[PDB]
Amino acid sequence: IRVFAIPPSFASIFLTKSTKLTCLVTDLTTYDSVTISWTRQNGEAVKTHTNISESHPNATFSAVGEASICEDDWNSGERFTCTVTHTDLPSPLKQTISRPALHRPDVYLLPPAREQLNLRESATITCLVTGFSPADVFVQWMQRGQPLSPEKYVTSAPMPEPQAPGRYFAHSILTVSEEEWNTGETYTCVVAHEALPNRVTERTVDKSTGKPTLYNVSLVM
Amino acid sequence: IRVFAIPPSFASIFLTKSTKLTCLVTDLTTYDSVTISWTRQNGEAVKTHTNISESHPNATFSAVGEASICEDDWNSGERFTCTVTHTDLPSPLKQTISRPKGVALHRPDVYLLPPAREQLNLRESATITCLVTGFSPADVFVQWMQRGQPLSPEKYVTSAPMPEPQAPGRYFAHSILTVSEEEWNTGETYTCVVAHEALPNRVTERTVDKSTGKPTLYNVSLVM
Amino acid sequence: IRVFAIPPSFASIFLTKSTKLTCLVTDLTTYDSVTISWTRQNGEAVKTHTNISESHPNATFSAVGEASICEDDWNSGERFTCTVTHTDLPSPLKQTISRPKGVALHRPDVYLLPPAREQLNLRESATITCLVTGFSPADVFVQWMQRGQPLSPEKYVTSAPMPEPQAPGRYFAHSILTVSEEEWNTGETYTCVVAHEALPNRVTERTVDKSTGKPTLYNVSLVM
Numbered sequence: 001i002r003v004f005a006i007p008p009s010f011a012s013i014f015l016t017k018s019t020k021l022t023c024l025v026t027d028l029t030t031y032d033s034v035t036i037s038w039t040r041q042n043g044e045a046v047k048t049h050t051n052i053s054e055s056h057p058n059a060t061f062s063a064v065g066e067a068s069i070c071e072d073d074w075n076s077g078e079r080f081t082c083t084v085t086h087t088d089l090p091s092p093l094k095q096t097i098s099r100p101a102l103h104r105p106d107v108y109l110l111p112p113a114r115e116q117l118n119l120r121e122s123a124t125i126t127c128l129v130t131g132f133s134p135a136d137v138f139v140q141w142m143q144r145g146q147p148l149s150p151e152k153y154v155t156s157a158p159m160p161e162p163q164a165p166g167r168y169f170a171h172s173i174l175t176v177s178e179e180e181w182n183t184g185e186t187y188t189c190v191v192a193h194e195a196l197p198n199r200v201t202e203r204t205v206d207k208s209t210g211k212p213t214l215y216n217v218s219l220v221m
Numbered sequence: 222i223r224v225f226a227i228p229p230s231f232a233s234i235f236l237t238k239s240t241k242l243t244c245l246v247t248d249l250t251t252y253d254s255v256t257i258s259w260t261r262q263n264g265e266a267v268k269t270h271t272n273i274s275e276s277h278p279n280a281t282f283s284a285v286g287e288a289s290i291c292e293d294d295w296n297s298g299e300r301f302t303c304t305v306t307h308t309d310l311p312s313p314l315k316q317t318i319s320r321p322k323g324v325a326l327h328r329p330d331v332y333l334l335p336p337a338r339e340q341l342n343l344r345e346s347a348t349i350t351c352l353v354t355g356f357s358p359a360d361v362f363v364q365w366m367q368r369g370q371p372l373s374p375e376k377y378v379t380s381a382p383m384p385e386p387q388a389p390g391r392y393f394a395h396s397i398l399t400v401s402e403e404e405w406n407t408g409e410t411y412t413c414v415v416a417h418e419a420l421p422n423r424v425t426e427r428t429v430d431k432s433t434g435k436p437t438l439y440n441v442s443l444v445m
Numbered sequence: 446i447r448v449f450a451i452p453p454s455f456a457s458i459f460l461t462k463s464t465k466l467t468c469l470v471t472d473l474t475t476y477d478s479v480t481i482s483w484t485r486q487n488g489e490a491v492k493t494h495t496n497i498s499e500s501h502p503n504a505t506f507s508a509v510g511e512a513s514i515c516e517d518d519w520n521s522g523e524r525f526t527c528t529v530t531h532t533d534l535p536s537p538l539k540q541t542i543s544r545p546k547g548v549a550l551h552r553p554d555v556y557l558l559p560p561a562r563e564q565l566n567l568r569e570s571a572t573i574t575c576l577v578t579g580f581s582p583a584d585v586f587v588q589w590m591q592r593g594q595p596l597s598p599e600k601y602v603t604s605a606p607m608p609e610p611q612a613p614g615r616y617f618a619h620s621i622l623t624v625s626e627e628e629w630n631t632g633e634t635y636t637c638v639v640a641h642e643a644l645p646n647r648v649t650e651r652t653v654d655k656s657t658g659k660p661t662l663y664n665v666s667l668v669m
């Protein structure tokens with residue numbers, strides 16, 4: 001009879017610019033005619049839930065409920081609760097959810113290794129973000145102000161640092177070719193975190209990053 | 222009554238050079254006299270186990286059976302299954318664990334990325350990551366050794382292996398190492414070793430230094 | 446009657462990833478239908494001993510045999526005996542051979558030695574020597590690789606370990622690499638590896654290129 005809900009993380013809010021609600025009910029016998037209605041703490045109705053789900057094949061029933069609530073009370077601490085009406089229990093079970101240090105992340109960009117440029121077949125550029133709380137952040141890539149497709153980069157799950165008790169680190173690699181890296185392709189990444197007052201921190205790099213921008217010495221035969 | 226299965230990963234059989242297969246059982250009554258016996262495909266004698274775990278505060282009992290086999294036994298293809306016979310199980314549960322064959326092997330690509338100059342400006346911390354990519358299958362072991370002698374295991378965290386966006390059968394891993402700013406431009410090797418079951422020697426190592434990025438041909442200095 | 450045995454050397458265990466000991470019996474005559482097999486301390490059965498060798502034409506008898514022995518079992522200290530049952534000697538001859546424990550080990554130190562300038566001017570052949578010293582015991586496996594690919598066994602030969610006169614309990618071994626000078630101008634990997642028991646990962650990769658021991662030359666000291 002355990003009911004688990006997935007609160008909308010900051011990564012899913014900044015991406016589509018439209019936060020929603022969704023609660024799931026498991027460990028229940030499969031049945032029919034189950035209505036899921038969301039109820040706020042005050043006691044007013046919400047948007048009409050549509051797009052019902054089905055039952056899991058493993059002799060279990062799953063129910064879903066959608067809503068459309070703007071950012072007016074989520075940041076304050078409003079307790080969202082969905083109501084599930086099942087025939088097995090006489091009294092519907094209600095489960096409430098809420099919003100659980102704010103360290104500013106520091107984005108560091110690392111140039112590709114010299115051993116990889118000799119292959120002249122691929123290039124890896126990372127977007128390192130360390131010291132951020134909480135986890136589940138969103139980092140994307142933009143090229144000359146135009147974001148790239150999500151299929152070209154994968155964001156790893158944040159993990160706690162070994163020495164830092166309350167700071168997390170994230171990684172975001174980008175698989176590109178070596179030929180393009182020599183003709184620009186800055187590949188500026190932006191991290192979306194709620195701890196930053198501006199919530200945006202982006203840095204740009206190019207081929208001439210290690211140069212102190214004072215001298216340019218090469219070798220000519 | 223549930224029973225789990227944790228096959229011996231490649232990273233767990235390298236730091237100790239001794240394989241150990243254990244099966245986990247959960248949702249059991251808090252009672253003593255627990256007998257967990259292992260067997261082979263045909264049925265042979267195994268080694269006894271001890272150090273029985275305690276019970277959970279929510280009235281849940283758990284146990285683990287320790288076993289020991291050879292190194293080539295796991296790669297031979299022989300399946301193993303632990304037998305748990307308690308005093309309240311109508312039917313003894315069983316789960317088969319083996320090594321799933323039929324996976325392509327690729328040599329991992331190790332590139333020890335040096336820390337950026339912007340991080341060193343603060344002069345308060347330094348992060349050294351070791352990029353590991355192009356390895357298959359998963360469960361790769363990454364270790365840090367400072368001048369031969371290794372460091373504490375609680376000084377580096379290895380990210381979970383995930384498939385590459387552009388490669389359907391390749392994985393990438395990360396492992397950062399936080400050090401002091403004054404400990405970067407000193408030396409101490411700082412070699413990243415990666416253990417994977419794809420190389421002929423199964424062990425590779427890549428090391429850099431403060432002069433790795435320099436062309437080591439000319440020393441141009443600016444004096445104000 | 447003299448019965449010999451070849452213990453599995455460390456250079457062969459790491460190469461084939463399988464310990465295969467061979468029992469050789471000499472000082473005999475020409476017969477047929479021999480019966481020789483190995484046994485453990487407990488007295489169990491072993492693998493087959495097929496693939497016999499032909500008798501030498503000099504009226505000398507020779508016998509070979511392979512067996513599958515786990516690496517952990519050999520390192521534990523189990524003694525193996527080669528049972529010899531022949532018509533010439535009806536008495537069962539016992540030949541116990543194992544690994545003598547109780548010897549201190551030292552971490553080998555690899556020092557790459559680039560070729561001298563007296564050879565590059567000839568433009569005939571390039572020789573790369575990988576001197577390894579400070580290791581014990583003997584039977585160390587040293588090979589060469591070319592970007593994750595081992596070279597041919599007929600190209601590089603590892604010299605037999607010899608005792609160091611200054612070191613009371615250490616040994617040194619050499620491994621030359623005779624290659625063409627045309628392919629040595631650029632250099633791809635030119636890495637040297639050593640397989641020793643005292644090493645943590647048992648493999649130490651040391652690479653060398655054209656510009657390895659050459660320091661900076663154009664030390665510019667401009668000031669404005």
Ligand SMILES: *[C@@H]1O[C@H](CO)[C@@H](O)[C@H](O)[C@H]1NC(C)=O
Pocket residue numbers: 208211216217218
């Ligand atoms: C130095 O200048 C040349 C031509 O002015 C240019 O091609 C080269 O890229 C410069 N060096 C660097 C490191 O950008």
Ligand SMILES: *[C@@H]1O[C@H](CO)[C@@H](O)[C@H](O)[C@H]1NC(C)=O
Pocket residue numbers: 216217218219
């Ligand atoms: C010197 O300047 C010329 C043109 O201004 C440029 O092509 C050349 O690369 C420069 N020298 C170096 C070492 O970059």
Ligand SMILES: *[C@@H]1O[C@H](CO)[C@@H](O)[C@H](O)[C@H]1NC(C)=O
Pocket residue numbers: 440441442660661664
């Ligand atoms: C290179 O130049 C820097 C300039 O300060 C100096 O400190 C360093 O010792 C020089 N290195 C060599 C090998 O000459």
Ligand SMILES: *[C@@H]1O[C@H](CO)[C@@H](O)[C@H](O)[C@H]1NC(C)=O
Pocket residue numbers: 440442664665666
């Ligand atoms: C290289 O030049 C720098 C410039 O100050 C000097 O300090 C250093 O001693 C020089 N090194 C050598 C080996 O000449």
